[PDB]
Amino acid sequence: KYEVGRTTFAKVKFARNTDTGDNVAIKIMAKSTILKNRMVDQIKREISIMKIVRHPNIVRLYEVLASKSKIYIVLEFVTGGELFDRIVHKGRLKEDESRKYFQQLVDAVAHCHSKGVYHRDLKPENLLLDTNGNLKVSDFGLSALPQLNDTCGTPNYVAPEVLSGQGYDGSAADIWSCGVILFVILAGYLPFSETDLPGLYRKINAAEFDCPPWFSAEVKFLIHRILDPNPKTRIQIQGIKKDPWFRKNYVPIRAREEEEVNLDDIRAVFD
Amino acid sequence: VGKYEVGRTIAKVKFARNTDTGDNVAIKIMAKSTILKNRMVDQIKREISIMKIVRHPNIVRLYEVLASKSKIYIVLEFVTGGELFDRIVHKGRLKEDESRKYFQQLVDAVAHCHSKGVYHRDLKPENLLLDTNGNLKVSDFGLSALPQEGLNDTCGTPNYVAPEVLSGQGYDGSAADIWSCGVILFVILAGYLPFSETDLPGLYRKINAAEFDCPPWFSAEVKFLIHRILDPNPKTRIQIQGIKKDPWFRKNYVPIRAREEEEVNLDDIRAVFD
Incomplete structure (x- = not known):
């Protein structure tokens, strides 16, 4: 959905949330590499915990987006x-x-x-x-x-x-x-x-x-x-x-x- | 200066020319104070001298050593x-x-x-x-x-x-x-x-x-x-x-x-x- 810009597995392209017209950096990664990983479960947990974290000093991740091959993490700019x-x-x-x-x-x-x-x-x-x-x-x-x-x-x-x-x-x-x-x-x-x-x-x-x-x-x-x-x-x-x-x-x-x-x-x- | 015409500057390494032979070298220049008042002054001395005396086709050579009341000068192959x-x-x-x-x-x-x-x-x-x-x-x-170092x-x-x-x-x-x-x-x-x-x-x-x-x-x-x-x-x-x-x-x-x-x-x- 995001109006993505640009730009081995961490190409943090710039982008914008069209619908609230806000642009937030996206860290992009191969879907496969992570899902197979000793820490995968911890990754999920840590990702989820932060995703809900809200603190004035912590950069937030607004949302996680999914693809067949890639995972998109949406992070405040x-x-x-x-x-x-x-x-x-x-x-x-x-x-x-x-x-x-x-x-x-x-x-x-x-x-x-x-x-x-x-x-x-x-x-x-x-x-x-x-x-x-x-x-x-x-x-x-x-x-x-x-x-x-x-x-x-x-x-x-x-x-x-x-x-x-x-x-x-x-x-x-x-x-x-x-x-x-x-x-x-x-x-x-x-x-x-x-x-x-x-x-x-x-x-x-x-x-x-x-x-x-x-x-x-x-x-x-x-x-x-x-x-x-x-x-x-x-x-x-x-x-x-x-x-x-x-x-x-x-x-x-x-x-x-x-x-x-x-x-x-x-x-x-x-x- | 002490046989050498110094340039500037590559611890501080500098380019220099050996005038007498008119050949060119790089020089490491450092304070006397820092070297002499170190746990390893003695080791430094021993190793430095050994290098000065070493001569090998694959080892960058230490031609000689220059000393001042204020600083130590190390000459090396360029x-x-x-x-x-x-x-x-x-x-x-x-x-x-x-x-x-x-x-x-x-x-x-x-x-x-x-x-x-x-x-x-x-x-x-x-x-x-x-x-x-x-x-x-x-x-x-x-x-x-x-x-x-450096x-x-x-x-x-x-x-x-x-x-x-x-x-x-x-x-x-x-x-x-x-x-x-x-x-x-x-x-x-x-x-x-x-x-x-x-x-x-x-x-x-x-x-x-x-x-x-x-x-x-x-x-x-x-x-x-x-x-x-x-x-x-x-x-x-x-x-x-x-x-x-x-x-x-x-x-x-x-x-x-x-x-x-x-x-x-x-x-x-x-x-x-x-």
């Missing part, structure tokens, strides 16, 4: 660009602005975490801004989505546990990345410098980083707790939400969403 | 040929025999370095280089020890990196260097990375598993060598000796020969920087 574009214009950002933004991210992540969903590839590409300027997080519950001369990063955030190549607590992983994002906003670089990869990994494993001088002591403390390499000893979302630095000028959003709509919808999600 | 992988872009895969040539050169070079007691620690395409003649030459050998723009692939390295702890350098050669060889032949770059956490999963799917066009013996090289276990990973003995590796191969003096008085090595 955020013009405000990437937040880190804003950083690049300025280098680092201010404590206050940064805290406003970090709070938003944490709240959105908490919301997603509450519904049993984890990101697992939380990075700045995902960080986005709505026209009014609010943070919308993206690719949430989309990570499970199946899978030359130039390859661009960055695996800097990738939590140590992931480095192991085994199993990781999703929440612990997401928070770790959240720690890094916070770090980049304030400091205007990555806590662990990319150029030397083996050394980068050693640094990540040791959690040894160069703090900037301008970071206040608390922020540093919060970051150390966020950037614990050990998932068991690392801070909880709850823990950080109750932080002294985090707490400042804080205010809790509260959403009003449907209790998870009939799974029947979930089973019928793809056909 | 190669016009550029990245080998540019060649891959043109024709996708390289052919089996040619790929074998290059692999022979790379293995020879690494082996020579390894014998001399030095390990690369960061073998990636940037380092693989070509000369006017079309021969391969390998850079940043003995410079991984170099401090903090924002949004990042051009690093972790695919080559060995798994043990992934941990962030300890490994024998050689096994890691062998792993990269394994990846390097694979990419040449196949015209892609063994493990998909995207979905990085799954990417790391693949690497630690050492799960990769060879193309059909790969011959059985090459597959064997790749499999043996791409052992996620570094105690069960093939040594340079093994790979040199390997069948597919044996084919048409001829040991390179070069002459360098026994490592010049370390006293020189300690006096390298002052």
Whole structure:
């Protein structure tokens, strides 16, 4: 139905909903590849949960469309660009602005975490801004989505546990990345410098980083707790939400969403 | 300046001309402060000196070292040929025999370095280089020890990196260097990375598993060598000796020969920087 524009399995073409004349980005994918997948059921569940998710900081997926060969996911279009574009214009950002933004991210992540969903590839590409300027997080519950001369990063955030190549607590992983994002906003670089990869990994494993001088002591403390390499000893979302630095000028959003709509919808999600 | 007329600027590498002989070189220029006050000043010294003394047709040469009260200057052979992988872009895969040539050169070079007691620690395409003649030459050998080598723009692939390295702890350098050669060889032949770059956490999963799917066009013996090289276990990973003995590796191969003096008085090595 959508008046689609343009544009290996994730050609996110632009489009518009003709009937309400609104244009929303569509992530398109081979129907086959997904439906056969170890995570297929989780994909369905995660897709369905989010589909019903409604939060000021989370980019929404309006609808899922089905084809014989392809699946179309309909996702809100955020013009405000990437937040880190804003950083690049300025280098680092201010404590206050940064805290406003970090709070938003944490709240959105908490919301997603509450519904049993984890990101697992939380990075700045995902960080986005709505026209009014609010943070919308993206690719949430989309990570499970199946899978030359130039390859661009960055695996800097990738939590140590992931480095192991085994199993990781999703929440612990997401928070770790959240720690890094916070770090980049304030400091205007990555806590662990990319150029030397083996050394980068050693640094990540040791959690040894160069703090900037301008970071206040608390922020540093919060970051150390966020950037614990050990998932068991690392801070909880709850823990950080109750932080002294985090707490400042804080205010809790509260959403009003449907209790998870009939799974029947979930089973019928793809056909 | 100190025999050299410097240009600008490719850590900061710069183009330079050796005036006295009137020949041309690239120079790495860095602060004295950063190098001397590093956990690894001693290792840096040893390896640097070894390189200065090394001489091999496939290894980018370290002519000499210049020291200032404020900074350290490293002179290196200049190669016009550029990245080998540019060649891959043109024709996708390289052919089996040619790929074998290059692999022979790379293995020879690494082996020579390894014998001399030095390990690369960061073998990636940037380092693989070509000369006017079309021969391969390998850079940043003995410079991984170099401090903090070298924002949004990042051009690093972790695919080559060995798994043990992934941990962030300890490994024998050689096994890691062998792993990269394994990846390097694979990419040449196949015209892609063994493990998909995207979905990085799954990417790391693949690497630690050492799960990769060879193309059909790969011959059985090459597959064997790749499999043996791409052992996620570094105690069960093939040594340079093994790979040199390997069948597919044996084919048409001829040991390179070069002459360098026994490592010049370390006293020189300690006096390298002052």
